[PDB]
Amino acid sequence: MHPMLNIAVRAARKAGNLIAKNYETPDAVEASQKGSNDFVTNVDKAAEAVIIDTIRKSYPQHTIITEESGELEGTDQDVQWVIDPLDGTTNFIKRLPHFAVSIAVRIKGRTEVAVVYDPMRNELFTATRGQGAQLNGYRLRGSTARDLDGTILATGFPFKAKQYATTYINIVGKLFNECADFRATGSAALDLAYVAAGRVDGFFEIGLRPWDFAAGELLVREAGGIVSDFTGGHNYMLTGNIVAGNPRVVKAMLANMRDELS
């Protein structure tokens, strides 16, 4: 737990330090046809290896699930480490300095530990279940906003889910008409961390993969916010359709979502 937290942080900083070091290089950037070149993937794979190696030196019995390898079953099925070694891939390739390592520990299907770590800003966000969220050791509470007016909402376009373009764009339209403004940062795990830290008032994105929200979602819930489905449910793990923020902000956002798809 806090020994697990201590290993999650160790792993996230060593992966983070390695990703920071290569950000300062260009070496071998080779693809354009869509975006993701050999270099980010080599950098990313090396981060993943470091995280796996670090976790297995103390907990070789656990299941580890990574964005790049899927599930590496352990003898002890009751603990899963759910990891994105580099949430913000396109950012990294463009050298936009906004990306993070996300590492969640789930025990018998409940997230108990969460680390999101920005290695450019050297900001480590952490949480353990029932004990709240911190940024570099200092307690987080969400934002204190009560409606959508003068709020800032982190979000991203459904680049990987284009068939939802119209619905999404329609949702963005409605929220804008309630005097919300938007940030689009390219790192969902960081967005969730920023919800936890009140740096934004809410977050909504479609089609997230579980490794990008598993740590972020606990950050929010431990800093007094909530996370839900676009339709209000606790179904978001299956969908990846995530609305996060305090209970007022989410209720207000969910209000603007009924009359759309999902």
UniProtKB/Swiss-Prot annotation:
Catalyzed reactions: a myo-inositol phosphate + H2O = myo-inositol + phosphate; 1D-myo-inositol 1-phosphate + H2O = myo-inositol + phosphate; 1D-myo-inositol 3-phosphate + H2O = myo-inositol + phosphate
Effect of residue 183 to A: Some growth at 30 degrees Celsius, greater IMPase activity, partially inhibited by RNAP
EC number, UniProt record: 3.1.3.25
Outcome recorded upon mutating residue 87 to N: Loss of IMPase activity, still complements dnaB121 helicase mutation
Family: Belongs to the inositol monophosphatase superfamily.
Quaternary data: Monomer. A monomer-dimer equilibrium. Homodimer. The rRNA transcription and antitermination complex (rrnTAC) consists of RNA polymerase (RNAP), NusA, NusB, NusE (rpsJ), NusG, SubB, ribosomal protein S4, DNA and precursor rRNA; S4 is more flexible than other subunits. Binds to RNAP, which decreases IMPase activity against 1D-myo-inositol 1-phosphate. Association with rRNA gene-transcribing RNAP is dependent on NusB. Interacts with AR2 domain of NusA; crystallizes as a 2:1 SuhB:NusA heterotrimer.
Function as written in the Swiss-Prot or TrEMBL entry: Part of the processive rRNA transcription and antitermination complex (rrnTAC). The complex forms an RNA-chaperone ring around the RNA exit tunnel of RNA polymerase (RNAP). It supports rapid transcription and antitermination of rRNA operons, cotranscriptional rRNA folding, and annealing of distal rRNA regions to allow correct ribosome biogenesis. This subunit may play a central role in organizing the structure. Has D,L-inositol-1-monophosphatase and beta-glycerophosphatase activity, has less to no activity against a number of other substrates. 2.5-fold more active on 1D-inositol-1-monophosphate than L-inositol-1-monophosphate (1D-myo-inositol 3-phosphate). Specific activity increases significantly upon heating. Only beta-glycerophosphate and adenosine 2'-monophosphate are alternative substrates.
Protein name: Nus factor SuhB
Gene: suhB
